[PDB]
mmCIF file of N, CA and C in Angstrom:
data_model
loop_
_atom_site.group_PDB
_atom_site.id
_atom_site.type_symbol
_atom_site.label_atom_id
_atom_site.label_comp_id
_atom_site.label_asym_id
_atom_site.label_seq_id
_atom_site.Cartn_x
_atom_site.Cartn_y
_atom_site.Cartn_z
ATOM 1 N N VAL Q 1 26.340 6.221 73.235
ATOM 2 C CA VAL Q 1 25.352 4.974 73.303
ATOM 3 C C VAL Q 1 25.277 5.330 75.168
ATOM 4 N N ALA Q 2 25.506 5.587 79.881
ATOM 5 C CA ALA Q 2 25.182 5.160 78.323
ATOM 6 C C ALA Q 2 27.021 5.254 78.325
ATOM 7 N N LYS Q 3 27.246 5.206 77.178
ATOM 8 C CA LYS Q 3 28.761 4.610 76.522
ATOM 9 C C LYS Q 3 29.021 4.972 75.161
ATOM 10 N N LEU Q 4 29.983 5.715 75.588
ATOM 11 C CA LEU Q 4 31.195 6.014 74.184
ATOM 12 C C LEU Q 4 31.830 5.232 73.012
ATOM 13 N N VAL Q 5 30.942 4.545 71.894
ATOM 14 C CA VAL Q 5 31.250 3.176 70.566
ATOM 15 C C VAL Q 5 32.404 3.986 69.536
ATOM 16 N N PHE Q 6 33.119 3.456 68.806
ATOM 17 C CA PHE Q 6 33.461 3.697 68.037
ATOM 18 C C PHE Q 6 33.624 3.093 67.111
ATOM 19 N N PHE Q 7 32.023 2.906 65.841
ATOM 20 C CA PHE Q 7 31.956 2.337 65.232
ATOM 21 C C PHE Q 7 33.570 2.431 64.033
ATOM 22 N N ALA Q 8 33.196 1.146 63.191
ATOM 23 C CA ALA Q 8 33.957 1.261 61.632
ATOM 24 C C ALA Q 8 34.008 1.940 60.622
ATOM 25 N N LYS Q 9 34.313 1.827 59.282
ATOM 26 C CA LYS Q 9 33.133 2.496 58.233
ATOM 27 C C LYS Q 9 34.229 2.742 57.607
ATOM 28 N N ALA Q 10 39.342 3.966 55.650
ATOM 29 C CA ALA Q 10 38.376 4.116 56.420
ATOM 30 C C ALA Q 10 37.617 5.597 57.352
ATOM 31 N N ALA Q 11 36.272 5.326 58.152
ATOM 32 C CA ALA Q 11 36.828 6.519 59.341
ATOM 33 C C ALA Q 11 36.183 5.548 60.199
ATOM 34 N N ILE Q 12 37.375 6.116 61.358
ATOM 35 C CA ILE Q 12 36.319 6.064 63.103
ATOM 36 C C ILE Q 12 34.592 6.553 63.293
ATOM 37 N N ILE Q 13 33.689 6.722 63.866
ATOM 38 C CA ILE Q 13 32.388 7.608 64.120
ATOM 39 C C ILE Q 13 31.762 7.030 65.500
ATOM 40 N N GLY Q 14 32.174 8.182 66.226
ATOM 41 C CA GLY Q 14 32.815 8.441 67.929
ATOM 42 C C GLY Q 14 31.040 8.113 68.395
ATOM 43 N N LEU Q 15 30.281 7.473 68.426
ATOM 44 C CA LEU Q 15 28.876 8.230 68.981
ATOM 45 C C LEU Q 15 28.435 7.765 70.702
ATOM 46 N N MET Q 16 27.663 8.640 71.259
ATOM 47 C CA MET Q 16 27.661 8.154 72.854
ATOM 48 C C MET Q 16 26.555 7.675 72.614
ATOM 49 N N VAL N 1 45.610 10.087 60.961
ATOM 50 C CA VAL N 1 46.518 11.667 61.333
ATOM 51 C C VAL N 1 47.881 11.129 60.985
ATOM 52 N N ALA N 2 51.858 8.366 62.908
ATOM 53 C CA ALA N 2 50.828 9.410 62.716
ATOM 54 C C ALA N 2 49.732 9.070 64.769
ATOM 55 N N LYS N 3 49.211 9.668 64.412
ATOM 56 C CA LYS N 3 48.283 9.548 65.518
ATOM 57 C C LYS N 3 46.445 9.332 65.485
ATOM 58 N N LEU N 4 46.315 8.302 65.964
ATOM 59 C CA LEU N 4 44.271 7.958 65.949
ATOM 60 C C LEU N 4 43.948 10.225 66.477
ATOM 61 N N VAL N 5 43.460 10.362 65.884
ATOM 62 C CA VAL N 5 42.577 11.026 66.571
ATOM 63 C C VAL N 5 41.098 11.952 66.229
ATOM 64 N N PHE N 6 40.700 12.490 67.297
ATOM 65 C CA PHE N 6 39.049 12.404 67.322
ATOM 66 C C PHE N 6 38.139 13.875 66.880
ATOM 67 N N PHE N 7 37.833 14.487 66.218
ATOM 68 C CA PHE N 7 37.648 15.468 65.296
ATOM 69 C C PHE N 7 36.412 15.587 65.890
ATOM 70 N N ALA N 8 35.644 16.925 66.410
ATOM 71 C CA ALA N 8 34.251 16.996 67.145
ATOM 72 C C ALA N 8 33.708 17.542 65.725
ATOM 73 N N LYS N 9 32.019 17.242 65.504
ATOM 74 C CA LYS N 9 31.213 18.209 64.990
ATOM 75 C C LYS N 9 30.290 17.659 65.171
ATOM 76 N N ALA N 10 25.430 15.274 67.872
ATOM 77 C CA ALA N 10 27.223 15.618 66.492
ATOM 78 C C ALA N 10 27.753 14.204 67.473
ATOM 79 N N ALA N 11 28.594 13.789 66.699
ATOM 80 C CA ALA N 11 29.934 12.587 65.941
ATOM 81 C C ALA N 11 30.531 12.847 66.172
ATOM 82 N N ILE N 12 31.417 12.143 66.501
ATOM 83 C CA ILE N 12 32.747 12.721 66.597
ATOM 84 C C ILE N 12 33.729 11.310 65.672
ATOM 85 N N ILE N 13 34.942 11.690 65.130
ATOM 86 C CA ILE N 13 35.702 11.048 63.716
ATOM 87 C C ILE N 13 36.295 10.799 63.798
ATOM 88 N N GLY N 14 36.792 9.256 63.973
ATOM 89 C CA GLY N 14 38.606 9.421 64.646
ATOM 90 C C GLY N 14 39.286 8.836 62.879
ATOM 91 N N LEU N 15 40.608 10.108 62.464
ATOM 92 C CA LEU N 15 41.285 9.318 61.462
ATOM 93 C C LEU N 15 42.845 9.030 61.758
ATOM 94 N N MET N 16 43.116 8.363 61.452
ATOM 95 C CA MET N 16 45.152 8.451 61.712
ATOM 96 C C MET N 16 45.140 9.625 60.700
ATOM 97 N N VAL B 1 37.213 -4.111 65.672
ATOM 98 C CA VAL B 1 36.610 -5.682 65.906
ATOM 99 C C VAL B 1 35.191 -5.918 65.085
ATOM 100 N N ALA B 2 31.782 -3.448 62.910
ATOM 101 C CA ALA B 2 32.722 -3.466 63.482
ATOM 102 C C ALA B 2 33.084 -2.354 64.219
ATOM 103 N N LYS B 3 33.637 -2.566 65.600
ATOM 104 C CA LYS B 3 34.531 -1.404 65.788
ATOM 105 C C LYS B 3 35.244 -1.477 66.227
ATOM 106 N N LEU B 4 36.271 0.380 67.355
ATOM 107 C CA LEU B 4 37.027 -0.349 67.958
ATOM 108 C C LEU B 4 37.572 -0.843 69.008
ATOM 109 N N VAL B 5 37.802 -1.448 69.455
ATOM 110 C CA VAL B 5 38.140 -2.242 70.960
ATOM 111 C C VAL B 5 39.973 -1.644 71.359
ATOM 112 N N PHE B 6 39.474 -1.203 72.900
ATOM 113 C CA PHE B 6 41.269 -0.961 73.434
ATOM 114 C C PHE B 6 41.442 -1.732 73.507
ATOM 115 N N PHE B 7 42.228 -2.569 74.464
ATOM 116 C CA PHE B 7 41.731 -3.561 74.620
ATOM 117 C C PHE B 7 43.459 -3.575 75.677
ATOM 118 N N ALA B 8 43.872 -4.189 77.019
ATOM 119 C CA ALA B 8 44.390 -3.577 78.249
ATOM 120 C C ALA B 8 45.085 -4.936 78.229
ATOM 121 N N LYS B 9 46.728 -4.600 78.375
ATOM 122 C CA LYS B 9 48.063 -5.593 78.443
ATOM 123 C C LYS B 9 49.126 -4.503 79.312
ATOM 124 N N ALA B 10 51.971 -0.676 81.827
ATOM 125 C CA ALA B 10 51.229 -1.622 80.457
ATOM 126 C C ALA B 10 51.144 -0.003 78.709
ATOM 127 N N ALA B 11 50.351 -0.173 78.546
ATOM 128 C CA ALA B 11 49.542 0.366 77.189
ATOM 129 C C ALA B 11 49.085 -0.632 76.952
ATOM 130 N N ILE B 12 47.433 0.760 75.937
ATOM 131 C CA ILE B 12 46.915 0.095 75.295
ATOM 132 C C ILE B 12 46.610 -0.326 74.048
ATOM 133 N N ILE B 13 46.284 -1.560 73.380
ATOM 134 C CA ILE B 13 45.812 -1.937 72.032
ATOM 135 C C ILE B 13 44.173 -2.001 71.388
ATOM 136 N N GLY B 14 44.426 -0.676 70.378
ATOM 137 C CA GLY B 14 43.524 -1.188 69.522
ATOM 138 C C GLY B 14 43.004 -1.956 68.368
ATOM 139 N N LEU B 15 42.082 -1.469 68.153
ATOM 140 C CA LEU B 15 42.498 -3.192 66.731
ATOM 141 C C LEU B 15 40.681 -2.919 67.121
ATOM 142 N N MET B 16 40.224 -3.284 65.304
ATOM 143 C CA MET B 16 39.590 -1.912 64.711
ATOM 144 C C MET B 16 38.241 -4.048 64.717
ATOM 145 N N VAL W 1 50.761 9.749 77.717
ATOM 146 C CA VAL W 1 51.733 10.337 78.662
ATOM 147 C C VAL W 1 51.706 12.101 78.398
ATOM 148 N N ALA W 2 48.665 14.769 82.223
ATOM 149 C CA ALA W 2 49.557 13.893 81.303
ATOM 150 C C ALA W 2 47.940 13.803 80.348
ATOM 151 N N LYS W 3 48.164 12.810 79.398
ATOM 152 C CA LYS W 3 46.847 12.917 78.573
ATOM 153 C C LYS W 3 47.871 11.312 77.635
ATOM 154 N N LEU W 4 45.895 10.624 77.919
ATOM 155 C CA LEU W 4 45.897 10.060 76.720
ATOM 156 C C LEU W 4 46.890 9.319 74.785
ATOM 157 N N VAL W 5 47.978 9.114 74.562
ATOM 158 C CA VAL W 5 47.920 9.582 73.111
ATOM 159 C C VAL W 5 47.424 8.137 72.918
ATOM 160 N N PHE W 6 47.152 8.122 71.494
ATOM 161 C CA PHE W 6 46.669 7.006 70.498
ATOM 162 C C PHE W 6 47.651 6.770 69.168
ATOM 163 N N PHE W 7 49.157 6.015 69.378
ATOM 164 C CA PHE W 7 49.701 5.909 68.134
ATOM 165 C C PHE W 7 49.616 4.725 67.085
ATOM 166 N N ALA W 8 49.225 4.997 65.716
ATOM 167 C CA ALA W 8 49.761 4.691 64.550
ATOM 168 C C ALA W 8 50.929 3.405 64.641
ATOM 169 N N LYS W 9 50.214 2.466 63.989
ATOM 170 C CA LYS W 9 51.859 1.244 63.339
ATOM 171 C C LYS W 9 51.527 -0.079 62.365
ATOM 172 N N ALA W 10 47.199 -3.397 61.419
ATOM 173 C CA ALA W 10 47.808 -2.242 61.571
ATOM 174 C C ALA W 10 47.109 -2.063 63.585
ATOM 175 N N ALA W 11 47.688 -1.512 64.195
ATOM 176 C CA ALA W 11 46.992 -1.686 65.310
ATOM 177 C C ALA W 11 47.225 -0.813 65.816
ATOM 178 N N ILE W 12 46.744 0.135 67.261
ATOM 179 C CA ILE W 12 46.962 1.386 67.397
ATOM 180 C C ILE W 12 47.305 0.770 68.600
ATOM 181 N N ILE W 13 48.037 1.544 69.382
ATOM 182 C CA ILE W 13 49.061 1.572 70.028
ATOM 183 C C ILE W 13 48.245 2.235 71.342
ATOM 184 N N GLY W 14 47.827 2.847 73.384
ATOM 185 C CA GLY W 14 47.622 4.213 73.727
ATOM 186 C C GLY W 14 48.578 4.747 74.531
ATOM 187 N N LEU W 15 48.810 4.934 74.632
ATOM 188 C CA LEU W 15 50.522 4.759 75.660
ATOM 189 C C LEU W 15 49.637 6.293 77.200
ATOM 190 N N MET W 16 50.067 6.900 78.190
ATOM 191 C CA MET W 16 49.169 7.749 79.251
ATOM 192 C C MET W 16 51.026 8.553 78.762
ATOM 193 N N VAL R 1 38.590 -1.704 82.436
ATOM 194 C CA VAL R 1 37.548 -2.930 82.838
ATOM 195 C C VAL R 1 37.399 -4.570 82.762
ATOM 196 N N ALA R 2 41.075 -7.658 80.250
ATOM 197 C CA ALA R 2 40.690 -6.075 80.353
ATOM 198 C C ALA R 2 40.052 -4.911 78.572
ATOM 199 N N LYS R 3 39.453 -4.055 78.689
ATOM 200 C CA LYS R 3 38.866 -2.729 78.636
ATOM 201 C C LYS R 3 39.265 -2.242 78.336
ATOM 202 N N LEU R 4 39.887 -0.685 78.351
ATOM 203 C CA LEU R 4 39.048 0.428 78.287
ATOM 204 C C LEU R 4 37.525 0.473 77.468
ATOM 205 N N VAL R 5 36.943 1.301 78.265
ATOM 206 C CA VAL R 5 35.653 1.301 78.265
ATOM 207 C C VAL R 5 35.947 3.216 79.059
ATOM 208 N N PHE R 6 34.392 4.313 77.499
ATOM 209 C CA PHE R 6 34.062 4.877 77.876
ATOM 210 C C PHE R 6 32.839 5.577 78.715
ATOM 211 N N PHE R 7 32.796 5.737 79.331
ATOM 212 C CA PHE R 7 31.815 5.547 79.922
ATOM 213 C C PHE R 7 30.921 7.498 80.223
ATOM 214 N N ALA R 8 29.173 8.179 79.877
ATOM 215 C CA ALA R 8 29.548 9.396 79.402
ATOM 216 C C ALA R 8 28.283 9.353 80.707
ATOM 217 N N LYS R 9 29.202 10.938 80.772
ATOM 218 C CA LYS R 9 28.232 11.251 82.091
ATOM 219 C C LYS R 9 27.544 13.304 81.824
ATOM 220 N N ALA R 10 28.190 17.933 79.946
ATOM 221 C CA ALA R 10 29.033 16.665 80.186
ATOM 222 C C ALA R 10 30.181 16.058 79.709
ATOM 223 N N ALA R 11 31.496 14.698 80.192
ATOM 224 C CA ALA R 11 32.075 14.754 80.500
ATOM 225 C C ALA R 11 31.939 13.228 80.013
ATOM 226 N N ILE R 12 32.831 12.602 79.038
ATOM 227 C CA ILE R 12 34.093 11.051 79.557
ATOM 228 C C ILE R 12 34.355 10.790 79.746
ATOM 229 N N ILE R 13 34.971 9.550 81.066
ATOM 230 C CA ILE R 13 35.147 8.768 81.718
ATOM 231 C C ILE R 13 34.996 8.025 81.409
ATOM 232 N N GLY R 14 36.826 7.384 80.972
ATOM 233 C CA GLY R 14 37.901 6.322 81.044
ATOM 234 C C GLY R 14 37.770 5.435 81.687
ATOM 235 N N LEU R 15 37.422 3.882 81.840
ATOM 236 C CA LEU R 15 38.528 3.271 82.622
ATOM 237 C C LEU R 15 38.572 1.834 82.601
ATOM 238 N N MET R 16 39.661 1.023 82.579
ATOM 239 C CA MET R 16 39.607 -0.016 82.830
ATOM 240 C C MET R 16 39.822 -0.494 82.873
ATOM 241 N N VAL V 1 37.853 19.762 72.833
ATOM 242 C CA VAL V 1 38.075 20.659 73.620
ATOM 243 C C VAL V 1 38.429 20.733 72.316
ATOM 244 N N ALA V 2 37.099 21.724 66.969
ATOM 245 C CA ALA V 2 36.981 21.077 68.013
ATOM 246 C C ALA V 2 37.875 19.423 67.614
ATOM 247 N N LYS V 3 38.985 18.099 69.333
ATOM 248 C CA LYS V 3 39.492 17.314 69.331
ATOM 249 C C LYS V 3 38.647 17.483 70.514
ATOM 250 N N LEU V 4 38.269 15.753 70.631
ATOM 251 C CA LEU V 4 37.977 14.843 72.017
ATOM 252 C C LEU V 4 40.014 14.598 72.389
ATOM 253 N N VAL V 5 39.974 15.172 73.408
ATOM 254 C CA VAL V 5 41.186 15.386 74.693
ATOM 255 C C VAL V 5 41.433 14.703 76.175
ATOM 256 N N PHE V 6 41.849 12.986 75.896
ATOM 257 C CA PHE V 6 41.907 12.065 77.040
ATOM 258 C C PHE V 6 42.568 12.397 77.933
ATOM 259 N N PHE V 7 42.316 13.344 78.825
ATOM 260 C CA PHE V 7 43.403 13.541 79.650
ATOM 261 C C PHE V 7 44.016 12.654 81.058
ATOM 262 N N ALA V 8 44.611 12.322 81.397
ATOM 263 C CA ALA V 8 45.220 11.355 82.802
ATOM 264 C C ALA V 8 44.852 12.458 83.921
ATOM 265 N N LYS V 9 44.940 11.329 85.342
ATOM 266 C CA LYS V 9 44.522 12.266 86.339
ATOM 267 C C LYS V 9 44.720 10.782 87.666
ATOM 268 N N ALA V 10 44.327 5.417 89.399
ATOM 269 C CA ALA V 10 43.049 6.668 88.854
ATOM 270 C C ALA V 10 41.933 6.889 87.626
ATOM 271 N N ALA V 11 41.942 7.483 87.183
ATOM 272 C CA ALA V 11 41.047 7.152 86.095
ATOM 273 C C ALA V 11 40.930 8.451 84.715
ATOM 274 N N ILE V 12 40.489 8.767 83.013
ATOM 275 C CA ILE V 12 41.471 9.414 81.957
ATOM 276 C C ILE V 12 39.213 9.975 81.830
ATOM 277 N N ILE V 13 39.866 11.733 81.698
ATOM 278 C CA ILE V 13 38.622 12.002 81.345
ATOM 279 C C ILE V 13 38.425 13.026 79.964
ATOM 280 N N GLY V 14 37.924 12.167 79.348
ATOM 281 C CA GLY V 14 37.816 12.655 78.025
ATOM 282 C C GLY V 14 36.852 14.094 77.998
ATOM 283 N N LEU V 15 37.439 15.317 77.592
ATOM 284 C CA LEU V 15 36.642 16.673 76.827
ATOM 285 C C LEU V 15 36.812 16.379 75.811
ATOM 286 N N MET V 16 35.780 17.605 74.978
ATOM 287 C CA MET V 16 35.307 18.311 73.429
ATOM 288 C C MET V 16 36.439 19.309 73.808
#
């Protein structure tokens, strides 16, 4: 997103 | 997977 | 914490 | 541990 | 940076 | 590297 952001949901999804 | 493993695919998916 | 947050302390502690 | 390794336990513990 | 922050640039650079 | 690998060096360098 810059920074690598780790979203929760399970599984973790990393977005820049 | 223990260890948190970050798989490539984009987006990154973290699994224990 | 959502997002996986990595706190410093060493050792790093990850919390959702 | 080099590489940053994320151990499961919860909470995640990162060690070099 | 505390928290481990992952900056984008590629390659990712983690700073406390 | 697939998987996101975090190399030590400081600063941490993440490579797919």
